[PDB]
Amino acid sequence: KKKVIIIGAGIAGLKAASTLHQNGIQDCLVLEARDRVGGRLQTVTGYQGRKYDIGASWHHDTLTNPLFLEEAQLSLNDGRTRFVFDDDNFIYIDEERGRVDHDKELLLEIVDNEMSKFAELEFHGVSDCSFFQLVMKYLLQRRQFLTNDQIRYLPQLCRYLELWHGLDWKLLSAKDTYFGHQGRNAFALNYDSVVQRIAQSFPQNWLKLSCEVKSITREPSKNVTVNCEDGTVYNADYVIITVPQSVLNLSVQPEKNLRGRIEFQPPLKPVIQDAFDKIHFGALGKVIFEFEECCWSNESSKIVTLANSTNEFVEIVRNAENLDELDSMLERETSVTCWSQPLFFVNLSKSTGVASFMMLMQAPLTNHIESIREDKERLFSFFQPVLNKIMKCLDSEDVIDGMRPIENIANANKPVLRNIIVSNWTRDPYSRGAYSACFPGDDPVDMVVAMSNGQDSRIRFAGEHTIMDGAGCAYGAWESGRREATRISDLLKLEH
């Protein structure tokens, strides 16, 4: 009955569909489990109707990013604003010392650069370790050329990379930690606008929401059969599975009952199954802090508070005689606070004019914070200390809790918090995390190869976890969507 059935209406699924229509292919479907399209691209609304991408927010690698370039064209043609280049000089804040960025004496950014260079040389990749292990090796080998404060603060500064992978430094693969940024980043002014434009480019009656596909079977007759949970069954010539990696991973697990899990028959070939042993998922999370208005310096749109550090750490590094001795010596034995991990804050006031902070968090904090997302009081109590330090470093004062408003003129030039928004990607069965990430010992290529090769001729895969360029990214998934559709598109046309 159907030419192509696309499972998942995230950017990958949406582009594929868009591509099929664009190539004259008819009778296609887009089966999405959620009651909306967009997938991990979701723009939510908060205080005074302000909007925020709770999922993806930036166009990365703007030099080669095809999706971005496409958006660039549109903006060049209609003069409308679709994005803003918000890269900025990073402001680094330590609870005790305050700002430590661009410091004439700490020069942290410079040794951070040597650090990355150090990592590159290390894997040019005899045995992988965690990012934490690599930073410790660097400090030990280079301590002769590092001051005390550099040894203390640099390791905390370099962990901003945790916010790129969504994983604590002790959980992150050192080999995959440092990747090349192909140019500046462009903050999307509505990834929902990207979703809508693509979504509207194909037959609206093609979309089926709330269709949780439960099983996919390759009928030995040149036809694929798809069954959504409710009971509706379909048959198509080609199927493009774009469900996230974490969801697809349920398939290779026993006890088919998990929300989202699809039953493949025959099962996914071994090359696919094994791929999951060297892939894994990350948990980038988001907390939005909405204030009445801006009353703090807009020197930069990029701010990072560093986890607390100690002088005893420096002493231990200075005295350690070798890697092992350093390791155990570091073993020094609770309760997580906003200062237990680095936190990345986007000061939307400078880049968008909106008096709000978009904060990024990583596992294990993410899971914990998203778990208490309904408890605004606790949320404020948890982040209040880093929020106050930031305001102090930005020439302002302590934040006023106005989540339960009480108009008070006393709040002259005081920052007044009106709302807090939290992501929920780790508890959403259809996402179960943020995007593919590497634990030490992983090999991302495996999954790319297997996914791109597909289960077979009719069973294809798309998604941010199915491509090399832009892997884990919106544009990566977008392109993976075009890939599968164009391939199927050429195949149907050749049937002449």
Ligand X SMILES: C/C=C\C=N\CCCC/N=C\C=C\C
Ligand Y SMILES: Cc1cc2nc3c(=O)[nH]c(=O)nc-3n(C[C@H](O)[C@H](O)[C@H](O)COP(=O)(O)OP(=O)(O)OC[C@H]3O[C@@H](n4cnc5c(N)ncnc54)[C@H](O)[C@@H]3O)c2cc1C
Cα-based torsion angle of the residue sequence 126, 130, 135, 140 in order, rounded to the nearest 10 degrees: -60
Residue 474: partners with Cβ closer than 8 Å, 6 or more residues away:
11, 41, 56, 59, 60, 67, 191, 194, 464
CB of 110 to a copy of itself, least distance (A): 5
- 70 near a copy of itself, judged by CB under 8 A: no
Give, as one character, the DSSP assignment of residue 106: T
212 binds, among ligand Y, ligand X, a copy of itself, none (CB under 5 to 8 A by kind): ligand Y
Tokens (6 digits) for 376: 């605004």
Tokens (6 digits) for 193: 């606008």
Nearer to ligand X (CB atom), residue 18 or residue 466: 466
In degrees rounded to 5, what are phi and psi of residue 41? -110, 110
CB of 173 to ligand X, least distance (A): 9
User: In this chain, which of 26, 89, 413, 457 binds a copy of itself, going by CB under 8 A?
Assistant: 89
- 440 near ligand Y, judged by CB under 6 A: no
378 Ramachandran zone, left/alpha/beta (phi>0; psi -120 to 50): alpha
436 binds, among a copy of itself, ligand X, ligand Y, none (CB under 5 to 8 A by kind): ligand X
CB of 268 to ligand Y, least distance (A): 14
Binding-residue total with a copy of itself (CB under 8 A): 30
Nearer to ligand Y (CB atom), residue 213 or residue 450: 213
In degrees rounded to 5, what are phi and psi of residue 319? -90, -25
Instruction: For 134-199, give the DSSP string.
Output: HHHHHHHHHGGG--HHHHHHHHHHGGGGHHHHTB-TTTSBHHHH-----S--EEES-HHHHHHHHH
Nearer to ligand Y (CB atom), residue 296 or residue 475: 475
User: In this chain, which of 44, 72, 316, 491 binds a copy of itself, going by CB under 8 A?
Assistant: 72
Cα-based torsion angle of the residue sequence 129, 131, 136, 142 in order, rounded to the nearest 10 degrees: 100
Q: Rg for the chain (alpha carbons), in Å?
A: 24
User: In this chain, which of 46, 70, 85, 411 binds a copy of itself, going by CB under 8 A?
Assistant: 85
* Helix or strand run (H / E) with residue 93: strand 91-94
CB of 78 to a copy of itself, least distance (A): 13
- 446 near a copy of itself, judged by CB under 8 A: no
CB of 123 to a copy of itself, least distance (A): 14
- 208 near ligand Y, judged by CB under 6 A: no
In degrees rounded to 5, what are phi and psi of residue 163? -80, 0
- 140 near a copy of itself, judged by CB under 8 A: no
- 299 near a copy of itself, judged by CB under 8 A: yes
* Interface residues toward a copy of itself, by CB under 8 A: 62-64, 72, 75-76, 85, 87-89, 102, 104, 107, 109-111, 114, 117-118, 121, 144-145, 180-184, 186, 299-300
* Interface residues toward ligand Y, by CB under 6 A: 7-13, 31-34, 39-41, 55-58, 60, 211-213, 242-244, 247, 260, 262, 284-286, 423, 425, 430-431, 434-435, 463-464, 472-475, 477
